Amino acid sequence: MKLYCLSGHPTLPCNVLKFKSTTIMLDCGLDMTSTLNFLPLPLVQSPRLSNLPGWSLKDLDKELKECSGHVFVDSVPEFCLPETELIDLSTVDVILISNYHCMMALPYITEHTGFTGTVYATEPTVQIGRLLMEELVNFIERVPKAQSASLWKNKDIQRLLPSPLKDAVEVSTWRRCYTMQEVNSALSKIQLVGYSQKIELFGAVQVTPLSSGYALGSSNWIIQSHYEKVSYVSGSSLLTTHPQPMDQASLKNSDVLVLTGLTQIPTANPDGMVGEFCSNLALTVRNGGNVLVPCYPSGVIYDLLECLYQYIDSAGLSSVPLYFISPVANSSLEFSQIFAEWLCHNKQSKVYLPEPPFPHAELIQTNKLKHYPSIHGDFSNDFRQPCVVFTGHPSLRFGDVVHFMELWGKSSLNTVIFTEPDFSYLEALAPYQPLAMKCIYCPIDTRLNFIQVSKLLKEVQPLHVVCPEQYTQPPPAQSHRMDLMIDCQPPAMSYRRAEVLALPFKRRYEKIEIMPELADSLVPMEIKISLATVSAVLHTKDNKHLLQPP
Amino acid sequence: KSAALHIDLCKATSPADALQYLLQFARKPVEAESVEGVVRILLEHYYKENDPSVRLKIASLLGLLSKTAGFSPDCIMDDAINILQNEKSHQVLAQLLDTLLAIGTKLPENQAIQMRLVDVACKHLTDTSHGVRNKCLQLLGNLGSLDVQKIIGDYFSDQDPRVRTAAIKAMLQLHERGLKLHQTIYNQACKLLSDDYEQVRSAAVQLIWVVSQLYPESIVPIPSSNEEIRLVDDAFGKICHMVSDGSWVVRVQAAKLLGSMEQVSSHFLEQTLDKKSGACGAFVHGLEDEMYEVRIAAVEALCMLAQSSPSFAEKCLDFLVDMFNDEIEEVRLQSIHTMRKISNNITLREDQLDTVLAVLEDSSRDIREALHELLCCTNVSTKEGIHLALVELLKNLTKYPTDRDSIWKCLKFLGSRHPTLVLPLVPELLSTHPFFDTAEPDMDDPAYIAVLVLIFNAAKTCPTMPALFSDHTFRHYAYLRDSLSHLVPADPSQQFLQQSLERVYSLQHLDPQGAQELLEFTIRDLQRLGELQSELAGVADFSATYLRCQLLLIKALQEKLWNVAAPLYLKQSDLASAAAKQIMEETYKMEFMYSGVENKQVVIIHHMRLQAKALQLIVTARTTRGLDPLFGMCEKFLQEVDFFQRYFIADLPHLQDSFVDKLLDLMPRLMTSKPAEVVKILQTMLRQSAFLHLPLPEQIHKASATIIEPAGESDNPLRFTSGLVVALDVDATLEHVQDPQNTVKVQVLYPDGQAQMIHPKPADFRNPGPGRHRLITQVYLSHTAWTEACQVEVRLLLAYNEGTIPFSKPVKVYIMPKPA
Amino acid sequence: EMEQRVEPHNDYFSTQFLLNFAILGTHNITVESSVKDANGIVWKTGPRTTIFVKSLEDPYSQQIRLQQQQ
Incomplete structure (x- = not known):
């Protein structure tokens, strides 16, 4: 019926679907791209970042520090929340969560907004996003900076700011990182679900999570209320990835298909980017340099660790240690091992044998890949100079990646290789910018590109299509490629942040059940079809109607 | 900027960007008169817009502005009910009822507006939408008529489970606010206890517990029998049946509410721990549940009910013994703690005792400490069991020597409360041969003190046989009384501090050498007094730092640099420049490392800070040849003095003849004086400034x-x-x-x-x-x-x-x- | 340029400095011993002891640096 749009981010959505007599929030997405405007949080007080020159405005110099012509806020990195004031969040009943990447900011809705409903997500999304929330809170709270800078978030001053800081949107809604007790309270109210499981919400609507194929546990949602169905297609993959393949059959004959989470930089083959990542890694470690891979502890790191496992024996790089430093590294590896039921048929055929499903587990027993909770504990005693480090947050503002770049950026032999497409590569390198390090940008986004989603929409044929505004337009990097947009026979329905969409797909014919006592009392008169005049008393219970004979 | 809001809403666009502007406006606080203005403007703009989302945002913003602190919302209710009169959108109506609930909650005293709001809620309860009914039930629950109970009881049987939960929570809020409920509520909530929804069942079991607590002694008939049952017993049976629910939080809620039904009859209490009506085996089922939270809640329910009923504790005993070995450590901590709580008068027999002593061997220190306090609070017969307890405690001491203090506390409590049973065991514990002269046992051996602590605490209350001790045991008794006396049983300074401070104050007319000597003597005395009286140490070194500030000021004001001219001044033998910095550091240390400071001390601290700043100004003016930097920090110092007179204007008439008031007398001259003359008059006026007094804090x-x-x-x-x-x-x-x-x-x-x-x-x-x-x-x-x-x-x-x-x-x- | 105010406790004092030599070659370092009395007056009395430090490069590091430069 109605569809509220609390997030403008395409791959980090927060859409509230006011559907019949039940209010459904489709995902909650924390925009961590807001953190790029802030100065990075290091593990130790680096001399270079500490005495950066301040930036002056003739109208604040302690708040703003300029590095290589780009102005950065010297406070803690703040996070752009979904906009929580368009619709009262005490009126929403159910939060459906697709990805663990789209489960961030759940402590913001579930605690600060008076949301008293229930949350549905799969087992692996809840566990992995618990790990990601844990390392995010840890990274913010290792060396606590203060939230000193507040004057730059003013309407008079942010106009005068340069382009990276002026273009930041909804700055007053940015908030500090939530704490660990908020994480625990948010994840305590999640009801765990499995793929193709029917969940009835107050007898009115029926929601099921369908396998999406992007990440292990990641799910698309369909919301059925009698004879009308809403399909929510979040980040999904049509490629041969580790999780269960995308369930395209259950999305069919849907009245409106809300789709989000398409591929950022769609003009990139992920297999070619894996090849480029392995080639650049081999080239760097063959020269005696160092490879730094800023990555999430889960997700694409499993795929690139699989490919690097297949590559090190071919390239002869068995003497090069692979280090995986993360506070949730061991938990991520173990969680990937035990979620075999959520993987594709190739991976879950391996656990029918007494064998680990992911091949990176063999790297620990062969000691090729060593994982540590932190730099300080015993990684500082097991460190060999030519090495590959998978660590830190990919935003390059917090985590162990900051210390590693401050350590290795003064040498041209060392390289950093970017595999996550979530954050802008130039804006990630901007606060470290006078560096001799070679930076390789090879994003391995495996989500749906535009030819794949054109084929999917031709296969499914939804009556209406709801997408973000960025999918109707060409990407601003291209701004001319007409194939890089969503095109359907109806010209879609685009939305921006804080926009309310009215869906005119509401119909008549709510289903009813008639007991056999009334069925005998109705004479099937011949019309030619049949006709019958019925007189009954209507009984409604739990939003399900019954007809009773008087 | 209310007119700016009016112009921006009615001038840019109607449909979409007005919502964006309202969203941007909603994030800033508004002053109360401006709250009234913007409320009038937004309510005027409510009728213009036909878009439902804009009106929903308007209603939400009215609800937000009604919650502002200084704004009395009594003047905006009539326009609110007017816009509810002709509102058709159900979401906007629900947001408007939320606004009205905020209005009613902000004004609890006005009964007329509360009656008007509950009339509006009763009018709008027949709405087809569930959200409007939910908000109207919330409105009735928050305000009520403390008729309302009958209406909410009618709405217990609504088709939507959310409205049923809203009705139960509303009438629970009515009870919590003070209203006494009826009894038909019990029958309605009993009917609703079998609901197909989790939240309805949890709210219904809460309401059942509340109505049981309100009328415990009421008599209700069995629906299927002629016999009559007390209301609290019947509701106890219903909540015991809800302990076996399919939802674990409902089970936790049922156990927690079951713990608070202390008025239940004894018969159902023995029923609830049996294994052979509906209350049978409720706690047995709750103690073995898969979720550890349910087991913990059942443990506290057992604790509360056994504290209420002494006959229940004997039945609680063996289940707690069995559940000491539980897979979750928090659960067994809670079981040991509640076992200690309910061990008031019941005795332990052999198998329960040695199960406790078997779980004493566990590697966790936390449950070992908890079980140690249980052994402190336990009562036991059959003195061979006490010997077994001592043997297990001694081998725990051997296996874990860190717990020796807790084990000694255990043996003190065992000896002190089981005196007659230890008495025949004494020749078996102390290796007392009947005729042989026994070797003196090694003192400071923690097993031997543990034996002696048990023996001596047994001998305190029983003087029947203390002659069983040998000579070396009496010597060890003396040693333990000297060393472990907490286990084994059998203001001149303030006046001097005031006197020294008033001696300093009353001798402020001496030569500089005598003043320095007096200050040095009193600083030494205050330091040693702080080293002697521990509770006066803070005030002693507080006053010592103050007198050190004054001594540094006196020594700086009596330097050789005042006797030489400005060009002949040399800083390589200077003393006053370091003195001013030291007084600054001591004033900051005085202000911030002392807990009990107040304004009446902060004013003297800042006065000494001003004196130090003046001294540093004169010292820097000695070594400056240019006129403009001297004028610069002279103006800065006068600005600091002006800030001081502005901040501390209340207690200015207490600082007679001091630096600041003698500055204030010459202040109009001080603005118009040449800065070198300002420096000269400051130098001549510090020497004539009177020493202040410290008001002593009560606790510092x-x-x-x-x-x-x-x-x-x-x-x-x-x-x-x-x-x-x-x-x-x-x-x-x-x-x-x-x-x-x-x-x-x-x-x-x-x-x-x-x-x-x-x-x-x-x-x-x-x-x-x-x-x-x-x-x-x-x-x-x-x-x-x-x-x-x-x-x-x-x-x-x-x-x-x-x-x-x-x-x-x-x-x-x-x-x-x-x-x- | 470094400074450390150490307090002698038995007519003997000891402190440890951390000197960085990025520029290769002979580095002449000098150490002073100023004495601050009880009144806070600084007395420059101690000897000006000088030792020369040579910053020799690792052959592997030198080869790596020349390869990166060329």
Whole structure:
């Protein structure tokens, strides 16, 4: 019926679907791209970042520090929340969560907004996003900076700011990182679900999570209320990835298909980017340099660790240690091992044998890949100079990646290789910018590109299509490629942040059940079809109607 | 900017960007008169817009503006009910009812507006939407008519489960606000207890517990029998049946509410722990549930019901014994604690006792300590069981020697409360041969003290046989009485401090040498008094620092540089320049490292700070030849004096003949005077300034800090790879720190010039007592390669609103960054 | 340029400095010993002891640096 749009981010959505007599929030997405405007949080007080020159405005110099012509806020990195004031969040009943990447900011809705409903997500999304929330809170709270800078978030001053800081949107809604007790309270109210499981919400609507194929546990949602169905297609993959393949059959004959989470930089083959990542890694470690891979502890790191496992024996790089430093590294590896039921048929055929499903587990027993909770504990005693480090947050503002770049950026032999497409590569390198390090940008986004989603929409044929505004337009990097947009026979329905969409797909014919006592009392008169005049008393219970004979 | 809001809403666009502008406006506070203005403007703009989302945002913003602090909402209710009169959208109507609920909650005293609002709620309860009915039920629950109970009881049977939960929570809110409920509520909630929805069942069991607590002795008939049952017993049976629910939070709620039904008859209480009506086996089912939260809640329910009913504890006993070995450590902690709680008068027989003594062998220190307090609070017959308890405690002491104090407490409580049973055991414990002279046992051997603590506490209440002791046992009794007296049984300073302070005050007419001698004597006496009376140590060194400030001022004002001219002044033999800096440091130390300061002390502290600033101004004016920098900080000093007279204008008439009031007398001259003449009059007027008095605080302590975890006495370096990080753990004992969350800072100082300052998070400022704080941070250290393990300097700091001062003892830690 | 105020406890003091030599070659370092009395007056009395430090490069590091430069 109605569809509220609390997030403008395409791959980090927060859409509230006011559907019949039940209010459904489709995902909650924390925009961590807001953190790029802030100065990075290091593990130790680096001399270079500490005495950066301040930036002056003739109208604040302690708040703003300029590095290589780009102005950065010297406070803690703040996070752009979904906009929580368009619709009262005490009126929403159910939060459906697709990805663990789209489960961030759940402590913001579930605690600060008076949301008293229930949350549905799969087992692996809840566990992995618990790990990601844990390392995010840890990274913010290792060396606590203060939230000193507040004057730059003013309407008079942010106009005068340069382009990276002026273009930041909804700055007053940015908030500090939530704490660990908020994480625990948010994840305590999640009801765990499995793929193709029917969940009835107050007898009115029926929601099921369908396998999406992007990440292990990641799910698309369909919301059925009698004879009308809403399909929510979040980040999904049509490629041969580790999780269960995308369930395209259950999305069919849907009245409106809300789709989000398409591929950022769609003009990139992920297999070619894996090849480029392995080639650049081999080239760097063959020269005696160092490879730094800023990555999430889960997700694409499993795929690139699989490919690097297949590559090190071919390239002869068995003497090069692979280090995986993360506070949730061991938990991520173990969680990937035990979620075999959520993987594709190739991976879950391996656990029918007494064998680990992911091949990176063999790297620990062969000691090729060593994982540590932190730099300080015993990684500082097991460190060999030519090495590959998978660590830190990919935003390059917090985590162990900051210390590693401050350590290795003064040498041209060392390289950093970017595999996550979530954050802008130039804006990630901007606060470290006078560096001799070679930076390789090879994003391995495996989500749906535009030819794949054109084929999917031709296969499914939804009556209406709801997408973000960025999918109707060409990407601003291209701004001319007409194939890089969503095109359907109806010209879609685009939305921006804080926009309310009215869906005119509401119909008549709510289903009813008639007991056999009334069925005998109705004479099937011949019309030619049949006709019958019925007189009954209507009984409604739990939003399900019954007809009773008087 | 209310007219700006009017112009922007009615001038830019109607449909979409007006919503964006309202969203932008909703994020700023509004003053109360401007609240009235914007409420009038938004309610005028409500009728213009036909878009439902804009009207929903308008209703939400009215609800937000009605919650502002200084705005009385009594003048806007009539327009609110007017816009509810002709509102058709159900979401906007629900938001408007939310606004009306905010209006009613903000004005509890006005009964007429509350009756109007509940009339509106009763009018709008027949709405087809569930959200409107939910908000109307919330409105009735929050305000009511303390008719309302009948209407909410009618709405217990609504088709939507959310409205049913809203009705139950509304009438629960009615009970919580003070209204006494009826009894038909019990039948309605009993019918609703079998609902197909989790939230309805939880709310219904809460309502059942409430109506049972309201009318416990009421008599209700069985629906299927002629016999009559008390209301609290019947509701106890219903909640016991809800203990076996399919939802674990409903089971936790049922167990927790079952713990508070202390008025239940004994018969159902023995029924609920049996294994052979609906109350049978409820606690047996709850103690073996898969979710540990349900088991914990059933443990506290058992504890509350056994504290209420003494006959219930004997049935609780064996289940607690069986559930000591539980897979979750928190569950067995709770079981041991509640077993200690319900061990008031019941005795333990053999198998329960040695099951307790078998689980004494566990490796966890926490449950060992908890079981130690249980053995402190236990009652046991059959003195061979006491011997078994002693043997198990002694072998626990052998296996875990750290728990010797707790084990000695156990044996003290066992001897003190089982005196006659230990008495025949004494020749078996003390190796007393009937005729042989026994060797004296080794003192300071923790098994032997443990035996003696048991024996001596048994001998305290029984003087029947204390002659069984040998001579060396009496000698050891004397030794333990001298050493372990808490286990084995059988204001001149304030007057002197006031006298010394008034001796300083009353002898302020002496020569400078005599004044310096008196101040030195009194500072020494105050320091030694602080070293003697511990509770007066803070006020002693507070007054000592004040007298040190005055002594430094007197010594600086009597320097040889005043007898020479400005060109002949030389700073390489200067003393007053360091003196002014020292007085500044001592004033900051005085203001911020003392807990009991107040305004009546802060004014004298700031007065001494002003005197130090004036002294530094004159000292710097001695060595300056240019006229404009001298004029610059002279103007800065006069600005500081003006800030001081503005801030402390209330207690200005208490500082007679001081520096600041004698400045205030000459202030109009001081603005119009040439700055060198200002410096000269300040130099001549500091020497004539009268010494102030300190109002002594009632309770004042130094902020003390010592770190123990770096432990700077080990020469072993802490090695790590160059360029990587090494973690250092600290443990600070912060004593009498007012706000350690935002003042205590950790400083690490490398051997080079690096002095990295670490701000600890508030999450690990543990507070184990009043005035006591514990700081546990894992500070992070890194540097490139060293040719030798040098040092690092770890120091706690205190920060104040502009600078930081040393706080704790400097501690050195060895660091060896090895190359990669 | 470094400074450390050490306190002698038994008419003997000891402190440790951390000197960085990025520029290769002979580095003449000098150490002073100023004495601060009880009144706070600084007395420059101690010897000006000088030792020369040579910053020799690792052959592997030198080869790596020349390869990166060329």
